[PDB]
Amino acid sequence: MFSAKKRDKCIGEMSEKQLDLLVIGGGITGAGIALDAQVRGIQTGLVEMNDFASGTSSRSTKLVHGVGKERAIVYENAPHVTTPEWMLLPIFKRYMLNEKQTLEKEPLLRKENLKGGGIYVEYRTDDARLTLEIMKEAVARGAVALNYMKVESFIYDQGKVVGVVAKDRLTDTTHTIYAKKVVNAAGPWVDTLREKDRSKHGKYLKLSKGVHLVVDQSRFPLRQAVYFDTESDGRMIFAIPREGKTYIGTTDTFYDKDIASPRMTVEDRDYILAAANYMFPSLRLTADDVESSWAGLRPLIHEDEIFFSDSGLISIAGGKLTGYRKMAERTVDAVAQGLNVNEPCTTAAIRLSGGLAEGAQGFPRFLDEASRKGAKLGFDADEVRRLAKLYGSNVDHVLNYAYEGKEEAEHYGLPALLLGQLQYGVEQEMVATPLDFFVRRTGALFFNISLVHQWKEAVLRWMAEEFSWTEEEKTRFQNELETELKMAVDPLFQVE
Numbered sequence: 001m002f003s004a005k006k007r008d009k010c011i012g013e014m015s016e017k018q019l020d021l022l023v024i025g026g027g028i029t030g031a032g033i034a035l036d037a038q039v040r041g042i043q044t045g046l047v048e049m050n051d052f053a054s055g056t057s058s059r060s061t062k063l064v065h066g067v068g069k070e071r072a073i074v075y076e077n078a079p080h081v082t083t084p085e086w087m088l089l090p091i092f093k094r095y096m097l098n099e100k101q102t103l104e105k106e107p108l109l110r111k112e113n114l115k116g117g118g119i120y121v122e123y124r125t126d127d128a129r130l131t132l133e134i135m136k137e138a139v140a141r142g143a144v145a146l147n148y149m150k151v152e153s154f155i156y157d158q159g160k161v162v163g164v165v166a167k168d169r170l171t172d173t174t175h176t177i178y179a180k181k182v183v184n185a186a187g188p189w190v191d192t193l194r195e196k197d198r199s200k201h202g203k204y205l206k207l208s209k210g211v212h213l214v215v216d217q218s219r220f221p222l223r224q225a226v227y228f229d230t231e232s233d234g235r236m237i238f239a240i241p242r243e244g245k246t247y248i249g250t251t252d253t254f255y256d257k258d259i260a261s262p263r264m265t266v267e268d269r270d271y272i273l274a275a276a277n278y279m280f281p282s283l284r285l286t287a288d289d290v291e292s293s294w295a296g297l298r299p300l301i302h303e304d305e306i307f308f309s310d311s312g313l314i315s316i317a318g319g320k321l322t323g324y325r326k327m328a329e330r331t332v333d334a335v336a337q338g339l340n341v342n343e344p345c346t347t348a349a350i351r352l353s354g355g356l357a358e359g360a361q362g363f364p365r366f367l368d369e370a371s372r373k374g375a376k377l378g379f380d381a382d383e384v385r386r387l388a389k390l391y392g393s394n395v396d397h398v399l400n401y402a403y404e405g406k407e408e409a410e411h412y413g414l415p416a417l418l419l420g421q422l423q424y425g426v427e428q429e430m431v432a433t434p435l436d437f438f439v440r441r442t443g444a445l446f447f448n449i450s451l452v453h454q455w456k457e458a459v460l461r462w463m464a465e466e467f468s469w470t471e472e473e474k475t476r477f478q479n480e481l482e483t484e485l486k487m488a489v490d491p492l493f494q495v496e
Ligand SMILES: Cc1cc2nc3c(=O)[nH]c(=O)nc-3n(C[C@H](O)[C@H](O)[C@H](O)COP(=O)(O)OP(=O)(O)OC[C@H]3O[C@@H](n4cnc5c(N)ncnc54)[C@H](O)[C@@H]3O)c2cc1C
Pocket: 024, 025, 026, 027, 028, 029, 030, 047, 048, 049, 050, 051, 052, 053, 054, 055, 056, 057, 058, 059, 060, 061, 062, 063, 064, 065, 149, 150, 151, 152, 185, 186, 187, 188, 189, 193, 209, 210, 211, 250, 251, 295, 296, 297, 298, 299, 318, 319, 320, 321, 322, 323
């Protein structure tokens, strides 16, 4: 089905049945359109150049901003992806807090001039898993999707776009896909597809880079997330606690290089650590405290719109995380308009992949339950609990593979529970790369980079076997992962 071992059966599956809609982009937006369109009867296909969420949808600060109602919808439909937590906004010269109280919330805050603060609740999500769960739900309802399929050229007929040309980045082959409507939800790449349609006119895009560093909690012991100012600068910064770590706020610099390879520079790092130390003088945050980091590209219109060409291509310059749903409904409104569909948007009711029927409230009982069910399979109750939180109701699936592969796992010298996450990833999360698993299905590259160092050998060895990789594939797929691991910590690591 949605496995990375059936790609050929999935390529010739959408290049056979004529598609009503084909969307370019596996971002939160592409997945968003894919799901909505699919749940209205518009048979949709989706093509993602690299990995689902591999673009900017995996490089945000991961905050679902509150819009208030929309933030709920998201939470209730997938409580394991988003979780509300407290945010602490210090004050210098909802709950209104004075100085002593503020210091009591975060006893690490700068004392000098602290007048107080306000603490409120904010929903923290998993941009990559969110993107994915929308994808999995879309596919589950009839949508066909493929990562590592790159649209390199458009197909026209009587002046109109009727299909794309996609190159399978994993096998290097090319294919043709036809669709009644073609949406371009390519994020910061939108204009490239607009050039391949020769319609990049008027309002074009200008890119802006932002970076996040990640230090270990022991070295930045935040009680709850804090939203603070900067010394000189003029901007604000987000220090967020997660999985025993604290990833610190964002930078803002112009960007016009390669849209697929932005990363942390020495300026970026020295800028985040600087401010962080300004706000928390107790810490002596140096370049050796950062154990990981990431860069992302944010597009801005020059001279949340939607573009229409003379060929009929629909581009989504918007690209919203917090507002992805209405954004999708709006986009599908246009598609449905064109293909003429008398079907209402009811996506705010659709639970996402792994979402509980009971919605948020029902999740505690859910973990207590899944924790006990996993234990009866001879697994650590706390371990499965954490996996339940990760995978949502889909834990059963990972608990099945994990169960079934106790022998395989031993032979491959890796914990059964980890082997379960892999088979699920390959067979039901369309994982075809080690990078897919370590950075997007688990987020380990960012939040537990030592874990990927520990298991990169054993994992590559297994995948090599699971996919019948050649020497070139095994070696390449190993350099790809090794490369990112290097860029994650070292800003001087030179490529090529
Ligand atoms: C520093 C920073 C901080 C941020 N903070 C927040 C925040 O606090 N809250 C918030 O809500 N959002 C935040 N965001 C970002 C916002 O969430 C995203 O911009 C928005 O969700 C992105 O929609 P994206 O889905 O357009 O589609 P994208 O994710 O940009 O689509 C990416 C995909 O398009 C694919 N693609 C490109 N070209 C082709 C092609 N020719 N063929 C096939 N596939 C192709 C790429 O391979 C890639 O996988 C932040 C961003 C940055 C950079």
